[PDB]
Every structure is written in C-alpha cells, then in structure tokens.
Write a protein that binds this ligand. Structure first.
Ligand SMILES: COC1=C(OC)C(=O)C(C/C=C(\C)CC/C=C(\C)CC/C=C(\C)CC/C=C(\C)CC/C=C(\C)CC/C=C(\C)CC/C=C(\C)CC/C=C(\C)CC/C=C(\C)CCC=C(C)C)=C(C)C1=O
Ligand SMILES: Cc1cc2nc3c(=O)[nH]c(=O)nc-3n(C[C@H](O)[C@H](O)[C@H](O)COP(=O)(O)OP(=O)(O)OC[C@H]3O[C@@H](n4cnc5c(N)ncnc54)[C@H](O)[C@@H]3O)c2cc1C
Ligand code: HEC
Ligand code: HEC
Ligand code: HEC
Ligand code: F3S
Lengths: 540, 413, 136
C-alpha cells in the first residue's frame, strides 16, 4: 500500500476505536481504521458456539467460537495457547480474554456498562491509596451519557439503590425485569444485609437502535445471536457507512517520529508480512490495555529507545484488573439460573466507604448463566442411568449457583507488561508478558470477601461448596499507559494525549489511573469520546 | 377528538405529511419513492407563510379532491386525491376546520420535488387526470346494502384508500378498476390480494382474525410489515371497533379476483418436518465470517433459528411468529418474504414496539448478500411456506433497488 | 440399515426415551464405528443380553452389568445421546445441540441459550416444580 493517507488513523477497531472513528467521521474528518484481526460474522460465531463441546460451555469458554488468526492471535484458555504469558504470585488473575478483529473484545463481553463513582476519580485524594485521575467525574459525565445513548444502556431509572454515580439524565432505557434467580438472590442477600441492585447493561429492554429487544438468550458471553446488546462492530459499521475506511488484518508494528517527537507515519503488516506505510495528521492507538503498551514498547525508535511515549518509564507498568474469587454450590432451594441476561444484578453495597484507605472495595455478584450444560455434564460424570439421570440433571440445573467477588487493585509499577524474550508469533512480534501481584490491599479485601461468600452460601443452604484458592481474571485491563498531570509520572494527560508526542492519542483503558470496583468499558468509551473532542479541537 | 381529527386519522393524512418520527407533524418533507423519482409531501399546517393557511374552503376542497393547488398547479398523484375525490362536502369541511383550528402552524418550508423530464412540468397531469377517470361524484349511501356495508366501503375507498396500494396500476400509473383490490407491487413491497377469493385473497380468513389484524397488525397467521405496519400504527389502531367491523363487513363482499397458480390459501401451507444437521456444521468451526456456509438450512439456523425456532413455528407466546402457516411465507409471490428479510419488521401499536432486525447490506446484526438471502428464502419457502415459490439473487437485488421499474419510468432516461 | 435399526433400538432402551432423532442416531453410529471398529458386535451383544435376561429398563441392565465389559460402551452410548459428543476434547465433534437429551429435563423452565424461550420478558413468571419431570 502506497501511503494510505488520512486525517486521523486509529489503530484497533474495538469499542473505543470504533466509537472514536464514528464521532470523527460524523464531524467531517477523514478516518483510517486499522485492525490486526479479521472481519467476523455474528451468525458464524453463533454456529461455532453451538457446535462447541458442552464441557466448553459448562466451563466458561468465551474464546473458542472466535477463531484465532496466526498473524494477530488472541487468548484461549481451553487448551492455553500461550499468547499471553503471565508470571508472579497472582498470574492466574491476569489470564484475561481478548478477541481480535473488527469489533474487538466487546464482540463477546457481558455488556455491563458502569459509571464510576466520583470518589473513584480521586481515590488517592480521598483515601490516600492508588492514584487520582487527571479529570473528575463531572468532566466525564457528558461523555458517559453520550456513550450510554450511543450504546443503548438500560438501568434502574427510578431507584435509590445505594450511593452510586450521580446522573444528570435518566438511562436511555429502563432495566428489564429480573428473572427468578435474580429475585431469589435479591431477597436472600437482603436478609443477609447485602444490597443486590440491577446492573446497568448495554442491552435492549425495548427495541432500540433498529435492533431487537432482548429475549433472554442468556448467551451474552460469548455471543448474542440476535444483536439485542451492544457490540463495537455497530460503531465500526456506522463509521464505515459515513466514509471511514477499514483495513482488517493490519498489524501495526512500527512508528516514526520527527525532530519534535511528533509521529509522522506508522507501519503495519498484512498476513503475509508485507509492510505498509500510513501517514496521517493524528494517530490514535485504541488496541487494548495489553496491545497498546505492547505496540508502544515494540515501536521503540532511536529518539525513543525505551519505547514510544515512555519518557517516564511507565508504559506497561501499573497493570490493573479486578481480581476475583469464584464460588459454586448447590442451593438447598431452587434458583433456576438462566432468566434474562447472564449478568442482571450485583451487590453494590461495598463499592464505597471509609474502609477504602485500608483494603479494597469490592463487588459481589451472582451469575445468571443457565446451569443446564453444567448440570448435564456433572450428572453424566456420576454414572447415573435412566430416570435417575434425568432427575439429577433437572435438580442440578435448578439448584446450581455460581457466585463471584471482584476486588479493586492499586496501580503497582512492578505489575508490568514487558515484551517476552522467549515467544513470538508468525509475524515475529514478541508475545505480551505480564507479571502480576494482587497486593496486600486486595488480600485484606479478600479475607473479608471470602467470609461474605461463605455467608451467602450458608444462607442458601449450599452444598458441594467450591471456592477458587486463586484469584481469577475479569478482563478489565486498565493501567499500562497511566494518565496524569506530571509528564514525569504519567504517559498521557487529561485529554488522553501523550506527553512525549503531541500527535498521539491513546483511546484505551490503559489510560485509567484507578480500576474502580465495577466493569470499566463504559469509562473507556467515555474517555474515547473525550479524546475525540480533543482531536476535533486540534484538527479544526 | 373532533370530527375533523377523526377524519384525518381515518384518512391517514398525517402519515405522509410528517417526515418520520421527528419532523413536527403535518410539516411535510417526507420523501415518497415514486417510479419517476422522489415526491415530497408539502406543508399542510395552517402557516400563512409556508403552509396552507391562506387556503379558503373551496381551495382546500380543490386540493383535497381534485389535485389542483392554490396557484392552479396540478398536484402529483402521490397525493391520493383520486381516492379523496368522493369525500362528502361535510367531511371536507370538517377536515378543513381541523386543519385551520387544531394543528399548530409550522414555519419551515419543505424540500421541493424535482422530477426528471418530462415529469418536471406539472401541467401534463391534466391529460393524465382525464385518462385516469378520477371524477368522482361525492359519496352517497347505497340503499340496497345496510349502513355497515356503506360505512365500510366509504372507509376503504375514500378515507383509508386501501386500493391505493392493493389495486394494481395500469401502464399510465392509473388505478386498474378491473383488478380491484387484487394485489399490487408498491415498490420493494407487495400488497397482497384482499378480495373475497378463498385461496387468492383473504376470503378464508376468520372474521376475528381480520378484525385483529386490522386493529393490531398481529395474528397467528399474518403480521403487518412495511407500508401495512405504518398504516395500522398511524391510522387503523385509532379507529373505533365499529369502523373496523364495517371495514370487515365490506371486505367480505368485495368480488373475488383469482391469482394464477393458487390452490391453498396463503396461511394454509403446512411445514415440512425437516431441518439442518448439527454434525455437518463441525467442519465450519474455525471459519469466522461465514462465506463457506452455502447450505440454506445451516444459514437459516445461524441467522434465524434463534427467534423462529428450528421447526419454523416461532415462540409459544406468539411474539416470534410461526413461519409455518404464515401469509408472507405462503404467498406464491415471495416479494414480501424478501422484503421482510431485507428490512425486518417495525410496528408500534398501543405504544408497544415489534421489531425484527434488518438483514440487508446495511444491517447491524448480520448483513447478508443477495445469494445468502435467496438461499434462506428458498429454504423457508420449501420447508415452511409456499413450496412452489423460488427466490434468486437477482430477485433480492431487484427488491433492494426498489422493485421492478415500471415501463413508464423509462421515458425519463 | 440393520446396524442403524439395532443401534436406534438399543439407544431407545439405554436412554429410556423412545423419540430419538434418526439423523443424529446415524451420525452417532458412524462416529462410534469410526472410533471403534467392533462397535456393531458390541451393540448386538448388549441387545442379546437384554433379550435373554428380559430386562425391563436400563436401570436393571445397568445394575446387572456393573462389571461386565459391555458396561463402558453402554455408558458411552448414553453419554453421546445426552451430551451430544463422543470424545472429551475441546475440539470434539458435536452431533446434537438443543436436541441433546441433557437439555430436555429442564426445557420447560431453562433456556437452551442461543434459542429463545417464548418472548422478550417471559421470565417474570414463576417456574415449575422441580419434582415434575416435563416430557420426552
Ligand atoms: C408531457 O409528457 C407526458 C404526458 O403528457 C400528456 C403524460 O401525461 C404522461 C403520462 C404519465 C404521467 C404524467 C405520470 C403521472 C404520475 C406521476 C408522475 C406519479 C405516479 C405515482 C402514483 C400514481 C402513485 C401510485 C402508487 C401509490 C400510491 C403507492 C403507494 C405506496 C406507498 C408505500 C406510499 C407521460 C408519460 C408524458 O411523458
Ligand atoms: C468474557 C468477557 C466479558 C466482559 N464483560 C464485560 C462487561 O460486562 N462490562 C465491561 O465493561 N467490560 C467487559 N469486558 C471487557 C471488554 O470486553 C473490554 O474492556 C473492551 O472490549 C474494551 O477493549 P478496547 O476497545 O480497548 O479494545 P479491544 O476491543 O479489546 O481491541 C481493539 C482492537 O485492537 C486490535 N489490535 C490490537 N493490536 C493491534 C495492532 N498492533 N495493530 C492493529 N490493531 C491491533 C485488535 O485486533 C482488536 O480488534 C469483558 C471482556 C470479556 C473477555
Ligand atoms: C432469518 C434469516 C429470518 C427470517 C427468514 C425471518 N425472520 Fe423474523 N420476525 C420476527 C418478528 C418479531 C416478526 C414479526 C413482528 C411482530 O409480530 O411484532 C418477524 C417476522 C418475520 C416474517 C414475516 C411475518 C409477517 O407476516 O410479516 C418472516 C417471513 C420472517 N420473520 C422470517 C423476529 C425475528 C428475529 C428476532 C430475534 C430474528 C433473528 C428473525 N426474525 C430472523 C428472521
Ligand atoms: C385499508 C382499509 C387496508 C386494508 C383493509 C388492508 N390494507 Fe394492506 N398491505 C400493504 C402491504 C405492503 C401488505 C403486505 C406486507 C408484506 O408483504 O408483509 C399489506 C397487507 C394487508 C393484508 C394482509 C394480507 C396477507 O395475506 O398478508 C390485509 C388484510 C390488508 N393489507 C388489508 C399495503 C397497504 C397500503 C400501502 C400504501 C395501504 C394504504 C393498505 N395496505 C391499506 C389496507
Ligand atoms: C389525509 C388528508 C390530507 C390532506 C388534507 C392533504 N393531504 Fe396531501 N399531498 C401529498 C403530496 C405528495 C403532495 C404534493 C404532490 C403534488 O404536488 O402533486 C400533497 C399535497 C397536498 C396539498 C397541496 C398543498 C401544497 O402546498 O402542495 C394539500 C392541501 C394536501 N396535500 C392536503 C401526499 C399525501 C399523502 C401521501 C401518503 C397523504 C395520505 C396525503 N397527502 C393526505 C392529505
Ligand atoms: S444473548 Fe442476547 S437476547 Fe439478550 S440475554 Fe444476551 S442480549
């Protein structure tokens, strides 16, 4: 490809990149959207999941329905494909799932769209731990609402659930009613002293955006068959309809900087390792909390020997997620998971408090995924026959419960994403490697979360109670390109523009200075739209 | 509501003069896809500057029933004045009073309709009107029939103007009164036969089914989409039960017009107890962005089986219609099936919204090519609907283009 | 067709459910014969055991075959009909989904995920009793 000129080139067609591309093409800018992964069809992913083995359904395999391409592989954990190497005492907690392609990981997310609390933006100022954001909640509120309106987020409109994020406008849709399992869990944990409240979801409680109302297919992870929930491929499609140009299978690997450290061009590979040069007025990397630092480190120049935008030596550091403890048991009374979406409600009681100066705030939730596949496989494993087999399957799908407790991790410089010195892919690019430690903050939080989950299991009369002795990953990759006011202590500023290169914006969750307590993709989308405002002001 | 407001709802005069959901009502600016090009509805709000606020009663009557503007210019027959022509003087006066006193003026000009030559000059429409035989004595009651039949005929012919879409047009794009209500192609959609023919038309429909479909657009065998969904959700759901009953009474007396190649009614096609193979799909894993899926059963299962079940009978509560025994899949003309796949369904009745997503090139959920749509339609027709019907990629492309081009439109080339 | 008929009869006896899909059964028999070359003779031996000992249901046959070498293949047939798979890998071929017999005992209440129960808000209703086995 000769030069591939554009006003702005965005690297990565995920939710962040596609939303940014749509806002930019809606405002008269020429946009070049590059994705390292292929184009994907929803119905083919649906067929792939349906023909995926039932043991891969019982245990939450979210990556097999999406085939991994050798030039831009993504993570698979049924049998682990070793794309993301994880080390450290808490490596199991960073075995995170990403999908590569036009649409990105939001192709198979649960679509839990959350606004952070105001204190979540000033954590260190409020509790003396972690880091403060470069901006406040009030500065991100309009972009929060804009992302909610574009994505079609439903929520508990008339409800004082708990101290939560203050809103200026109601949710675009009201939350759909609970299924039986969510109602039963709500009453039980209310008797337990916990506040189970509806989760704001990018899901259609009514027809919205020309897409159907949610019929409760209960397969939000890893694919909605009917498009009743938001996927970033929607924003990519809308941007392409407005004149944005999309090149799939474009694995960006190199960046060129001039004497002012502004980026002048980038270079990407095709599946055949043929190099293509791209020149633009503005460059945005919207790849991942993992792929963005990897690209920044891989593109080290002579002017930037330690990596692009790495004058502070912070690119790849402060890697964060929400460490999780999982539990599963058989409830004494029927719970009947499977009514509605896979994640309909959560305990928001402990999202905030004065304890947050000592140990992490947490989110306790109940999994609404149907337990029919798990019940069938388990009952088959017991060697049952005839009527006993059917009775066991029915009882186990009525009584099986999956429960989780996610924690907040502080930004730690030694939680790093160096490039691996032992593994590479087809294009010769090194594999990402994360060293993860959860910290005494999360360990002290977990000493209490474990007792809380035990109390939940006991209140339900649970048997065959099984806790994870390790921490689990929750796929909200934040940190790695930290934001702040000091260029010596951060990678980007409050407008997501890097301190080293005035030409470069990073629309990613890696910019977030705190992990918060709940899912972080809505914050990512809001920050991407804020960066869109900054880019528009720059180019006009 | 007033008598003028009731007449405006019955005549659906606001479904065209309102540009979609937005576009403050009766302000015009709505583009009508006519064979010769796009015709824009005008400003009917009583704005003395940009609307019809300077119209007198006689000028309003001329525009409504004869298609002559205030200036004296001929109105395009996209406005159904050929149907409104036989409206009684009292109804015209009531509509005038409603327009003048009850709809708020909107001071915003509408886009001007620019048609290709020789249709740009709206003065040849006088000869077209002479050839169309529009006039047109005002309606009077036939005393051989009862009052219900007369009221139903008035509603069907003068107010709701069903034949505007259900009566086919001749070469000159004028109504073909020989084939009254016999079904017509109105763009990407086809209004089916609604004569009393037991097999071709709606003669075999139960009275309750016809009433329920006209009131709500939803029935165990029929669902309203396209122009029918708009007609029901803008005019027919607000009509009194007496109005719908009179319409049904008149429709049961419409003389039958037979279709070629029809032996059973559109809703009387049983379903083949056949389906796809889960095993055959195993080779298609690791095959994202389905292009190697050319099987019609596999494509139907991947794109459609979630809502309409694998046996094509829909959901138990009827929210997702059964494709078996459905009047859209049971038509020998598969135009409506193609249009439904291409555009989906969207119908808001009683403030509750039906929606089937679109599956055409502009789809957000799953864009399908003409070949994939043809394959899915063929599978549905063979297994759930009219087995004698077939769909090809060129048919899907033609429906996408807006239907077959009428020969008259060739003059503007 | 003798092998298919014997396999389908033995499957209806082993799973305890008469209504079994013939295409799924044919695919399962082909896969079982590809995996094990002597599958048909084992099927015939199991049917001979059933007819000679006059076993009324699969419960009695399972109780009286807990150590005989034909127990693993009977359990495998049951597992293949209920699970929809024969192997134990993440790339094992799936021969039945939404028709597999392990999704049927809860079908009246629980969704088979990528296929809809009746309506976009059906879950506001109370579920059925666990003690009432639905159908099939
Ligand atoms: C000077 O040249 C010419 C003439 O002069 C003598 C002519 O008269 C003619 C004859 C033809 C015309 C003047 C065409 C007149 C008609 C139109 C421009 C508009 C045609 C449209 C309709 C009649 C609408 C009919 C269909 C409907 C209502 C469909 C409804 C469905 C919806 C979804 C809405 C020609 C060819 C000519 O060239
Ligand atoms: C199972 C699961 C459930 C989840 N549920 C939730 C939830 O309920 N709520 C929530 O808020 N979040 C959830 N998440 C997280 C959410 O999916 C991500 O945070 C979200 O996708 C944000 O990713 P992104 O847009 O930054 O980039 P992504 O969409 O992850 O990736 C963007 C694109 O970058 C491309 N790319 C990467 N490197 C390059 C390169 N060098 N050159 C070019 N292109 C490149 C990739 O191919 C990819 O398509 C979930 C995640 C998973 C795995
Ligand atoms: C996938 C390829 C298909 C195909 C071939 C069809 N559908 Fe659907 N459909 C859905 C709903 C809710 C309706 C009716 C509206 C309501 O009553 O509110 C329909 C309608 C149809 C029809 C025609 C019915 C009529 O008489 O016009 C046909 C032929 C048809 N569909 C075929 C719902 C859905 C979905 C919801 C998730 C999905 C997916 C599909 N349909 C997909 C398909
Ligand atoms: C005015 C009084 C009426 C009456 C009584 C009916 N219609 Fe229509 N109609 C139109 C279209 C495009 C369709 C079919 C859509 C599809 O292909 O899915 C229909 C359908 C009907 C039916 C159902 C027939 C069946 O077997 O499907 C019936 C009973 C019916 N109509 C009656 C289009 C239009 C219009 C377009 C401008 C107008 C006006 C009307 N219809 C008005 C009426
Ligand atoms: C229901 C009562 C109804 C009234 C009253 C009505 N219309 Fe119109 N009307 C039009 C179009 C199109 C034109 C202009 C075309 C022309 O110039 O030939 C028009 C023109 C007019 C005009 C001429 C004034 C001007 O500024 O052009 C008046 C008055 C009018 N309509 C009133 C489409 C419609 C449609 C389409 C579905 C419906 C229904 C319709 N109109 C129903 C009604
Ligand atoms: S899979 Fe889809 S239908 Fe609803 S429950 Fe999830 S958004």
């Amino acid at each position: 490809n000769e030069t591939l000129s554009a006003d702005v080139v965005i690297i990565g067609a995920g939710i962040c990149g596609s939303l940014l591309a749509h806002k930019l093409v809606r405002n008269g800018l020429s946009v070049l959207l590059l994705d390292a992964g292929p184009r994907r069809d929803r119905s083919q992913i649906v067929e792939n999941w349906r023909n995926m083995p039932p043991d891969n359904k019982s245990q939450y395999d979210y990556a097999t329905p999406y085939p991994s391409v050798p030039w831009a592989p993504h993570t698979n954990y049924f049998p682990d494909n070793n794309y993301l190497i994880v080390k450290g005492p808490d490596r199991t907690a960073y075995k995170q799932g990403i999908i590569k392609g036009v649409g990105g990981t939001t192709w198979h997310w649960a679509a839990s769209s959350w606004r952070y609390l105001p204190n979540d933006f000033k954590l260190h100022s409020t509790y003396g731990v972690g880091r403060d954001y470069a901006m406040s909640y009030d500065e991100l509120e309009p972009y929060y609402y804009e992302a909610e309106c574009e994505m079609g987020v439903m929520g508990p409109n008339g409800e004082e659930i708990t101290p939560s994020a203050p809103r200026q406008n109601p949710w675009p849709m009201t939350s759909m009613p609970y299924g039986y399992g969510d109602r039963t869990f709500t009453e039980i944990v209310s008797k337990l002293g916990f506040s189970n409240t509806p989760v704001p979801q990018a899901r259609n409680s009514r027809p919205y955006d020309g897409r159907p109302q949610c019929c409760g297919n209960n397969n939000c992870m890893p694919i909605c068959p009917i498009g009743a929930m938001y996927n970033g491929v929607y924003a990519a499609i809308k941007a392409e309809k407005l004149g944005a140009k999309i090149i799939p299978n474009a694995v960006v690997y190199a960046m060129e900087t001039d004497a002012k450290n502004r980026i002048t061009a980038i270079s990407f590979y095709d599946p055949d390792k043929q190099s293509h040069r791209v020149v633009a007025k503005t460059f945005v990397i919207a790849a991942n909390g993992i792929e963005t630092p990897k690209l920044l480190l891989l593109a080290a120049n002579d002017r930037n020997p330690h990596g692009i935008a790495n004058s502070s030596d912070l690119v790849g550091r402060n890697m964060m997620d929400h460490p999780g403890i999982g539990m599963s048991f058989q409830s004494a009374e029927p719970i009947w998971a499977g009514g509605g979406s896979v994640q309909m409600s959560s305990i928001t009681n402990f999202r905030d408090g004065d304890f947050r100066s000592e140990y992490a705030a947490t989110q306790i939730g109940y999994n609404n995924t149907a337990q029919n596949s798990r019940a069938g496989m388990k009952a088959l494993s017991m060697g049952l026959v005839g009527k006993k087999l059917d009775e066991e399957i029915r009882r186990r799908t009525a009584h099986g419960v999956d429960i989780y407790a996610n924690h907040e991790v502080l930004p730690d410089p030694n939680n790093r994403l160096v490039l691996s010195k032992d593994y590479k892919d087809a294009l010769g690019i090194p594999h990402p490697e994360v060293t993860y430690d959860v910290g005494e903050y999360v360990r002290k939080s977990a000493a209490i979360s474990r007792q809380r989950l035990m109390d939940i299991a006991k209140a339900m009369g649970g048997t065959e109670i099984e806790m994870t002795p390790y921490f689990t990953p929750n796929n909200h990759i934040t940190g790695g390109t930290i934001m702040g006011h000091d260029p010596r202590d951060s990678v980007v500023d409050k407008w997501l523009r890097t301190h080293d290169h005035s030409n470069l914006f990073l629309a990613t969750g890696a910019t977030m200075a705190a992990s918060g307590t709940v899912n972080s993709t809505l914050t990512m989308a809001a920050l991407s739209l804020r960066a869109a405002d900054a880019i528009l002001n720059d180019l006009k | 509501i007033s008598r003028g407001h009731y007449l405006a709802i019955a005549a659906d005069c606001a479904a065209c003069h309102t540009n979609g959901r937005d576009g403050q009502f009766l302000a015009g600016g709505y583009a009508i896809s006519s064979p010769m090009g796009n015709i824009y509805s005008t400003n009917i709000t009583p704005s003395k500057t940009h609307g019809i606020g300077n119209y007198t009663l006689e000028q309003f009557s001329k525009a409504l029933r004869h298609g002559i503007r205030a200036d004296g210019a001929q109105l395009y027959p996209a406005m159904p004045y050929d149907a409104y022509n036989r409206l009684t003087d009292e109804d015209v006066k009531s509509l005038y009073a409603y327009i003048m006193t009850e709809v708020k003026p909107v001071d915003a000009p509408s886009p001007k309709t620019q048609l290709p030559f020789p249709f740009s000059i709206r003065a040849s429409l006088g000869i077209w009107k002479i050839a169309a035989r529009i006039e047109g004595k005002p309606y009077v009651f036939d005393h051989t029939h009862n009052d219900d039949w007369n009221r139903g005929r008035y509603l069907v012919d003068e107010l709701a103007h069903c034949g505007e879409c259900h009566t086919p047009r001749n070469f000159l794009l004028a109504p073909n009164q020989s084939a009254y209500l016999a079904g017509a192609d109105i763009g990407s959609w086809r209004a089916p036969n609604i004569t009393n023919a037991p097999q071709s038309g709606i003669g075999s429909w139960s009275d309750q089914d016809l009433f329920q479909y006209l009131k709500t657009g939803k029935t165990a065998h029929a669902r309203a989409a396209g122009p029918m969904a708009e007609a029901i959700e803008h005019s027919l759901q607000y009509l009194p039960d007496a109005d719908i009953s009179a319409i049904v009474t008149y429709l049961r007396s419409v003389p039958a017009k037979a279709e070629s190649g029809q032996t059973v009614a559109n809703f009387e096609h049983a379903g083949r107890p056949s389906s796809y193979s889960v095993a055959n799909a195993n080779s298609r894993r690791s095959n994202s962005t389905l292009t190697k899926t050319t099987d019609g059963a596999a494509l139907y299962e991947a794109v459609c089986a979630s809502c309409h079940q694998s046996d094509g009978k829909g959901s138990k509560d009827g929210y997702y219609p059964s494709l078996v025994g459905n009047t859209t899949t049971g038509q020998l003309n598969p135009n409506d099936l193609i249009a439904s796949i291409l555009y989906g369904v969207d119908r808001t009745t009683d403030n509750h919204e039906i929606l089937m997503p679109a599956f055409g090139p502009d789809s957000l959920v799953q864009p399908l090519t003409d070949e994939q749509i043809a394959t899915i339609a063929d599978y549905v027709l063979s297994h759930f609907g009219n087995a004698q019907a077939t769909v090809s990629a060129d048919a899907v492309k033609q429906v996408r283009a807006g239907g077959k081009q009428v020969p008259l439109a060739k003059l503007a080339s | 067709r003798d092998s298919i008929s014997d396999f389908m009869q033995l499957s209806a006896f082993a799973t305890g459910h008469k209504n079994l899909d013939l295409n799924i059964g044919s695919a399962l028999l082909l896969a079982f014969e590809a995996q094990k070359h002597d599958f048909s003779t084992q099927i015939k031996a199991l049917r001979e055991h059933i007819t000679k000992n006059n076993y009324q249901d699969v419960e009695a046959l399972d109780a009286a075959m807990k150590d005989d070498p034909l127990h693993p293949t009977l359990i495998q047939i049951i597992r293949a009909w209920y699970s929809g798979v024969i192997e134990d890998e993440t790339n094992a071929k799936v021969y039945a989904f939404e028709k597999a017999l392990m999704y049927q005992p809860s079908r009246d209440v629980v969704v088979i995920p990528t296929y809809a129960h009746n309506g976009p808000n059906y879950w506001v209703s109370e579920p059925a009793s666990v003690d009432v086995m639905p159908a099939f």
